Design an enzyme around this catalytic site. Structure first.
Site, short mmCIF file in Angstrom:
data_model
loop_
_atom_site.label_atom_id
_atom_site.label_comp_id
_atom_site.label_asym_id
_atom_site.label_seq_id
_atom_site.Cartn_x
_atom_site.Cartn_y
_atom_site.Cartn_z
N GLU A 135 -12.01 -7.59 -2.34
CA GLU A 135 -12.71 -7.54 -1.05
C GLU A 135 -13.79 -6.46 -0.99
OE1 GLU A 135 -9.44 -7.42 1.69
OE2 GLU A 135 -9.68 -9.51 2.20
N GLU A 182 -4.98 -15.17 -3.41
CA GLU A 182 -4.08 -15.04 -2.27
C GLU A 182 -4.05 -16.38 -1.56
OE1 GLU A 182 -5.00 -11.82 0.37
OE2 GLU A 182 -5.45 -10.42 -1.23
#
Ligand code: NA
Ligand code: NA
Ligand code: NA
Ligand code: NA
Lengths: 408, 204
Positions: free
Chosen positions: A255, A331
């Site tokens: 991220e 994820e």
């Protein structure tokens, strides 16, 4: 705080400063070459020798010895303080998460008459991880990643991990048909990789880089003034963990958008360690800094057309024009409380499509902490319960197990 | 525009099209089509025929067309719809979500087919949504998938008009006849009528 171990190490003056192991195979994995690269520091002597011995339990499988002095690599010569030893292994027992066959490599620094200066050792698993034709292969076979994300968390001790909690996690993972763990989102304690070698779990080792809070998310990672700080976090991870057979994929972090520092660090890893793929999610999960399309929470059939970083459905994502890489969800199936509805839709799609090779569930254990109310009775606390402000309340608890490792 | 080559009845289906003794007969059917019709702007795709297996004569005639007319893609379905003799994956009646794993010629689902390893071509169904009588159930599932995926570029419904013929009973009243009604034997009965319109062009 000081949340991992502190130790003192005494080394001799002439010492082994680094050693790399690499395994190379033929087409049917019946002959392997263990290429061991040993580096010394200290004063060079012509009587110094390096012996690399390979052991299957108690029997010795291969052995080699050499004086220092590498091959010529450029116009100025070679490394006088390095050796490369190539050990031939006939019909090696291959490492996998199904059968975690390990060898024991012992690297002896010794003199020519034979007195030992220093010995080092590492567990060696014969395995090859490569992407051919759009499929991630382990030992020639396409993997199906039954993965889970795992933070280092203990409800009483915070982020301090001991061996008994690690063994408790690995047994519960394998008893629930997981074969892979993503180190979210930082390198773990060094004993974790040893236990994943031993019991058999694939490990995605992830650099300690996340700048989620920046606006835009790549404000630091597209700045070359932060390239020295980002490179240290990547290069020192690879130098610590490159000999573990359970580590099959490097991750550039989580991220952090997509900046030019990711592309540089992607190419750095592919140069120093060609034996492992590199994945990275930021910037829309299919940038030039990843070998694997690795979306976060992309759905099976529904597109999510966000501007400049759309989350396509995973079936659509594979078939985009010019797209050839495998897709492994870094994820998916966010397990927050009473959750994992529609988990069977992912596993129907994983089994149907060859280039969908599974994913990592978010996540393994709730990050709840223990407080005491007034009678000394413990209770599970989440964000906000310590006076922290602002906080994100119960988004810390996304586990498949409770913080004391009892199952949801 | 499709060459007049179909050897569906052969066992195996490429018995003639993998035989070089039939390469002169097959080449005439392809080369004279291209020489007749290459100037029409409406012709955008050449087709090597239908349902003839996959033989070496298809690969030769594929490459012949790409040499004389580079301006149009060549498609061919036989041999599993993704052979080297086609520029376009063109399956017949492949489903949207369901695989059909036939031996040596599987019909994958069209979403799966695009994502197979090493596969880059577009997919245009040369026949889909078989309109036999009261049919086209689930036609919206194809058009949801066509609009969602870029490399799914549509298809050709089978087919436009019923192939029914007119007979007269005893009063001179006409009635629509299908296979079997002329004494033909063996025949395939009503599989001749697959149209979206009746034979007099009134709609289903
Ligand atoms: Na798969
Ligand atoms: Na969370
Ligand atoms: Na389309
Ligand atoms: Na018909």
């Amino acid at each position: 705080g000081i949340f991992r171990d502190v130790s003192l190490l005494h080394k001799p003056t002439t010492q082994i400063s680094d050693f790399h192991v690499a395994t190379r195979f033929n087409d049917d994995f019946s002959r392997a070459v263990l290429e061991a690269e040993v580096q010394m520091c200290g004063e060079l002597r012509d009587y110094l020798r390096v012996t690399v011995s390979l052991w299957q339990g108690e029997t010795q499988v291969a052995s080699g010895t050499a004086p220092f002095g590498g091959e010529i690599i450029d116009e100025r010569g070679g490394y006088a303080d390095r050796v490369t030893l190539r050990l031939n292994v006939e019909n090696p027992k291959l490492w996998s998460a199904e059968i975690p066959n390990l060898y024991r490599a012992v690297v002896e620094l010794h003199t020519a008459d034979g007195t030992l200066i220093e010995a080092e050792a590492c567990d060696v698993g014969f395995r090859v991880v490569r992407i051919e034709n759009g499929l991630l292969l382990l030992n020639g076979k396409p993997l199906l990643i039954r993965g889970v994300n795992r933070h280092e968390h203990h409800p009483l001790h915070g982020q301090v991990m001991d061996e008994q909690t690690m063994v408790q996690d690995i047994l519960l993972m394998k008893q629930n048909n997981f074969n892979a763990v993503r180190c979210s989102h930082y390198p773990n304690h060094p004993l974790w990789y040893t236990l994943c070698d031993r019991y058999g779990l694939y490990v995605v080792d992830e650099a300690n880089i996340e700048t989620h809070g920046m606006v835009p998310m790549n404000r630091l990672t597209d700045d070359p003034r932060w390239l020295p700080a980002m490179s240290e976090r990547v290069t020192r991870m690879v130098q610590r963990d490159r000999n573990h057979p359970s580590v099959i994929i490097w991750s550039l972090g989580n991220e952090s958008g997509h900046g030019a520092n990711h592309d540089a660090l992607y190419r750095w890893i592919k140069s120093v360690d060609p034996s492992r793929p590199v994945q990275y999610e930021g910037g829309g999960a299919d940038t030039t800094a990843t070998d694997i399309i690795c979306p976060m929470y992309a759905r099976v059939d529904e597109d999510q057309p966000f501007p400049a970083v759309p989350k396509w459905s995973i079936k659509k994502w594979l078939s985009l024009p010019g797209e050839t890489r495998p897709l492994i969800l870094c994820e998916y199936a966010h397990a927050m409380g009473n959750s994992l509805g529609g988990f069977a839709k992912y596993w129907q799609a994983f089994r149907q499509y060859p280039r969908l090779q599974g994913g990592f569930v978010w996540d393994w254990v709730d990050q709840s902490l223990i407080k005491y109310d007034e009678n000394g009775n413990p209770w599970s606390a989440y964000g906000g319960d310590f006076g922290d402000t602002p906080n994100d309340r119960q988004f810390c608890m996304n586990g498949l197990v409770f913080a004391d490792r009892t199952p949801h």
